[PDB]
């Protein structure tokens, strides 16, 4: 509720229609607004169209934002969640007034689940850090995923040091660093270019060594 | 000369059917043997079977080997160089007497041309050598190609120093070499796993640099 209460207070700016995919066979798009009298999904229409396909309308939903705002959303049925094609989105108010218009590529808006199984180890024979882990569970195209390692801790030093990682890789030997240092590590997953694109996942559960 | 004559005195294994692809829409297969009074390409039949396509024939050619042995080859027709299906191969004497039978995958038998435009430079700012090159000319799927860098040094100074470059990379910066030394560098390419497989290419024409 510290991390929790930080969010209620960490104010963002303007509204935007935000879309993302977790595996590559789903698509969720939403927006959020001020809670207002009997304004439910029935006052909006969310229309999509895969390039060269009949126009389609999906079901809008509503749920509250942890901040008291409302969130409206649609989930495209897998069958239409194809990559490598221009997806046009249209959110309109029932008065005829246009709320949002966007064109996206589902393959460029990926937001993977974070990596599991983080294990750290002292490469005993050399004396150091051997970093291994697992990709986002139940996610395909494993050999496309780029990684990011976040080394840190060691009192007063605010080392939040990060090292990139090439795709399909799930091991990194933090070879050279310190003696008798508390160290905590975590890592993010991201679909790699140039086929895919997207957003940095949440950090994977940390692991702490103590040199 | 030297490499040729050295080549000429080398060892030898038995008869073996040899196939390879260069770009990904071609296949060459061949086998060598001893010269013969009255034996030509018309003495054997070379047939193939691309899974669930009917048996077909490829016409043999015959070429002399520098060593005095004869070479039978044939290059498959374009519409038959498909990549992820089993290719049935069979060479038979002109009397139905059996000679060869192999089964392959054109994607697992890549033998690319050598890299080009290799240049060496001294990174003024840091004192580092930076090597650059291009992929084999007219080769598709270039971000899947891996490269190996050979570093061979001056006079009596040469320990064997090679460098692995990851797929897609066509540059490399060699740090940590001796001063006033002559360094000659050269590259060679290979289709990476697990999609394609094959053989390392020939080296590229090299560049030499006085540190």
């Amino acid at each position: 509720k510290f991390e929790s209460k930080a969010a209620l207070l960490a104010a963002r700016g303007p509204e935007e229609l935000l879309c993302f995919t977790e595996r590559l066979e789903d698509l969720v798009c939403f927006w959020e607004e001020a809670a207002s009298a009997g304004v439910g999904p029935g006052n909006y229409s969310f229309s999509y169209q895969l390039e060269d396909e009949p126009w389609k309308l999906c079901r809008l939903h509503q749920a509250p934002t942890a901040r008291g705002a409302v969130r409206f959303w649609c989930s495209l049925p897998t069958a239409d969640t194809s990559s490598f094609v221009p997806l046009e989105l249209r959110v309109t108010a029932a008065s005829g007034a246009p709320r949002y218009h966007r064109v996206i590529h589902i393959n460029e808006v990926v937001l993977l689940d974070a990596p599991v199984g983080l294990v750290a180890r002292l490469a005993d024979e050399s004396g150091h850090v051997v970093l291994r882990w697992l990709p986002p569970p139940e996610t395909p195209m494993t050999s496309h995923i780029r990684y990011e390692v976040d080394v840190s801790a060691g009192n007063g030093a605010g080392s939040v040091q990060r090292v990139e990682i090439l795709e399909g890789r799930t091991e990194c030997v933090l070879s050279n660093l310190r003696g008798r240092t508390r160290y905590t590590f975590a890592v993010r997953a991201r679909m790699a270019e140039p086929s895919f694109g997207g957003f940095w996942s949440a950090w994977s559960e940390p692991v702490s060594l103590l040199t | 000369k030297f490499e040729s004559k050295a080549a000429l005195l080398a060892a030898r294994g038995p008869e073996e059917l040899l196939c390879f692809t260069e770009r990904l829409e071609d296949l060459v297969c061949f086998w060598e043997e001893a010269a013969s009074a009255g034996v030509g390409p018309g003495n054997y039949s070379f047939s193939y079977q691309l899974e669930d396509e009917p048996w077909k024939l490829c016409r043999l050619h015959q070429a002399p080997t520098a060593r005095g042995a004869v070479r039978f080859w044939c290059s498959l027709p374009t519409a038959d160089t498909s990549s992820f299906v089993p290719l049935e191969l069979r060479v038979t004497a002109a009397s139905g007497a059996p000679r060869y039978h192999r089964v392959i995958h054109i994607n697992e038998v890549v033998l690319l041309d050598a890299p080009v435009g290799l240049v060496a430079r001294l990174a003024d700012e840091s004192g580092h050598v930076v090597l650059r090159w291009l992929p084999p000319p007219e080769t598709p799927m270039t971000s899947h190609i891996r490269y190996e860098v050979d570093v061979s040094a001056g006079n009596g100074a040469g320990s064997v120093q090679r460098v692995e470059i990851l797929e897609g990379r066509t540059e490399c910066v060699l740090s940590n070499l001796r001063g006033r030394t002559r360094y000659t560098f050269a590259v060679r390419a290979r289709m990476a796993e697990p999609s394609f497989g094959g053989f390392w290419s020939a080296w590229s024409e090299p560049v030499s640099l006085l540190t």
Partner: peptide, 16 residues
């Protein structure tokens, strides 16, 4: 699912 061919860099796909 998709229809692909070898491009100069990597696969050029498209939904079948």
């Amino acid at each position: 699912t998709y229809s692909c061919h070898f491009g100069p860099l990597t696969w050029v796909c498209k939904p079948q």
